[PDB]
Each structure stands twice: as C-alpha cells, then as structure tokens.
Write a protein that binds this DNA or RNA. Sequence first.
DNA 1: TGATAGCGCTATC
DNA 2: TGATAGCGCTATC
Length: 327
Amino acid sequence: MIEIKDKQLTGLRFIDLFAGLGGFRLALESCGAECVYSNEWDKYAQEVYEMNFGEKPEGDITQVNEKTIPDHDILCAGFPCQAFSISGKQKGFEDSRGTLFFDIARIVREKKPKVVFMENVKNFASHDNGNTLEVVKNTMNELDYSFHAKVLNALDYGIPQKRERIYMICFRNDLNIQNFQFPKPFELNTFVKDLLLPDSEVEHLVIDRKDLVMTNQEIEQTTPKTVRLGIVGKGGQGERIYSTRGIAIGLSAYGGGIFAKTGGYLVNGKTRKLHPRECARVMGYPDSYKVHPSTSQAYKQFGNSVVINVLQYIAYNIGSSLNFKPY
DNA sequence: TGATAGCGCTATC
DNA sequence: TGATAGCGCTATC
Ligand SMILES: Nc1ncnc2c1ncn2[C@@H]1O[C@H](CSCC[C@H](N)C(=O)O)[C@@H](O)[C@H]1O
C-alpha cells in the first residue's frame, strides 16, 4: 500500500463484509475512515483478522439480522466469486456461494449507506451473458443508488501482478454524486524480482522437477506483463513458470498444482513458488501485516484477497467525490 | 473446522 | 483459430 496524506475519508464509518484478510479495511483506514463492523465466517480468516485488527468478525452473514449491523457510511464487500470465475463451473446465482450479493443488497436496504464499494473477478461482468451484472446493476439502482462499474488491472496501479477485478461503486442518489471517476492508470515501476525475499529465506520452496520443460529464455528487460518461461508436468493451473522480470500471474484460493495458488518462478536459475510474504507484497500488503501460521490458509487467504493499492486510489476518489459539496 | 497436487474446462483475441 | 491465464474443482492420504 501507499501512504495517503490528504485523508479523504476522515469522518466516515464503514463495514467490512466478507472481511477475509481485511484488505478493505487497510485501504479505507489509510484514507482516514473508521471500521465499525467486520463480517467473515472462515475460522482461519477470523484468526488472521483478529491477529491484525484485534477484532474477530461476526459469522455467516446469511443468518445475521441486518438491523444489527451498525450505522455506516460505506459498505465494503469483496463477495465470493467461485460461482462467476472463468476458473470454475460458473453456476452463478444458482450456486450456494453465488447468492451473497443479495445479502449485500438486503443489508443495503436496511442500513442504506452513502456508498457501496464492491469487488469481484473480471468474469462477473460477462457471466451468464451479462445477466449477473445486470441483476446487480438493477438491484442497486432499484435501491436508489448509482452504479459505476469498471475493470481495473493491478499492474496499472503500481503492483507487479496481473489481477483484473470489477469494482462497483454506488452512491445514494440523495448525494447527487456526478464527479466520481476511477483512478487513471500510470506507468508500472516495480516487478516481481523487486518484491522477492533473499534466497536464504526461500530455499524450501524451490522445487526441482525432472519434467520441468523450459519453453522460453529468461528476460533481462522488465515488462508489465506475465512472461511464461516454462511448464512442469502437463502445464495446467499451478504447473507453469514465469519470469520474475515480468509481473506475477494472479494468486488463487483453491488453486492446485505443484505451485499451488502462486505459480512458479525462475529465481537465480532455480524454480520455485512464492512465500506467503511475497504473496503479501504482490497483493500490496505491508510487511507489518502478520500472516496466518498455516501457509496453506495464508495462501488461500491471500489468493481470495484484493490488491490494496488499487483500493486506495478508489477509496481516495470515493472520498474526493463525497467531499465536493459546494454552495 | 486440512494439506497437497493433477487436473480439464472456459473466455479471450 | 492457437496459446494463455483463471480470487477453481476435487481426489487421496
Ligand atoms: N456466508 C459467509 N459469511 C461470511 N464470510 C463469507 C461467507 N461466504 C464467504 N465468505 C468469505 O468471503 C470471502 C470471499 S473473498 C474476500 C477477501 C477480502 N476482500 C479480503 O480483503 O481479503 C472469503 O473470506 C470467504 O470466507
């Protein structure tokens, strides 16, 4: 993340729905806002969130009396995506984990906050022909909210990672918000090799497979894109290797392969997966953030998360719009 | 409330 | 297309 000195969200309160690792909290908090509630049901997420924020989120949002949710100005929610991901089956709303948006809507109905800040994978925008996003768009509009939605890639915001997510920002119509805008992109100046730990602390992630097939030569000139250097086995998810002089492929939560959830990388002639700390950095998390003790859950936790940086710029801009109230 | 690893399909240009 | 990347799926221990 980056430091934000002109704190745009200073007096605002916000709720952390589907808290996960709390990336939404770090971002809005860096803009001056205040977290008055968190919700997340995964026992391990709850522990990492307690470890870092001293709070344990409430459980399963599905059976939480919405009226119980504390008054708040911005509702943040990075809702489940398995049901909309290009990487899964795609049953959308027909999936158990696909109905969560309607929980957001109903919390929005009761608490009607000033802004609604949501996040999902790029394919949520095309899922079921555009039906999912339209239903979402209509539900929000139907609640007296605007609905600004756009796809932003992590790599365009200073983080060496390919992560294309849809950000949906809704302001109550009351507010008459007509100046909202998504952060303008900017030149990437950091790449994987920059966030990499010293070889000493990562020996153990190095994997030497006889079936490692190098298909491309390493690169010396940095590029804001994922450059595949080789594969292992058949080359499926988690079985492909990339140059650290490019950007990181996206991290995943249930991902598999020998380079599970991280993908492989060629570091000094060796081939390894990222350490949970490198995942933190690739998601823009600060080194002060305490990772969960279970590397597996840590990886799952980081793979479900959001790139903080992106969120900061959006949060600043939400604050910027909200703040322009001339005479 | 678990850790690991081989998928095997889709969306995109 | 032809090659890649995907906040995934799911069997086995
Ligand atoms: N019914 C439910 N109640 C609470 N949390 C839920 C839930 N269904 C899914 N979740 C959680 O919602 C998250 C989807 S991922 C979001 C991660 C979050 N943006 C962060 O910044 O890391 C996961 O943590 C998942 O465990």
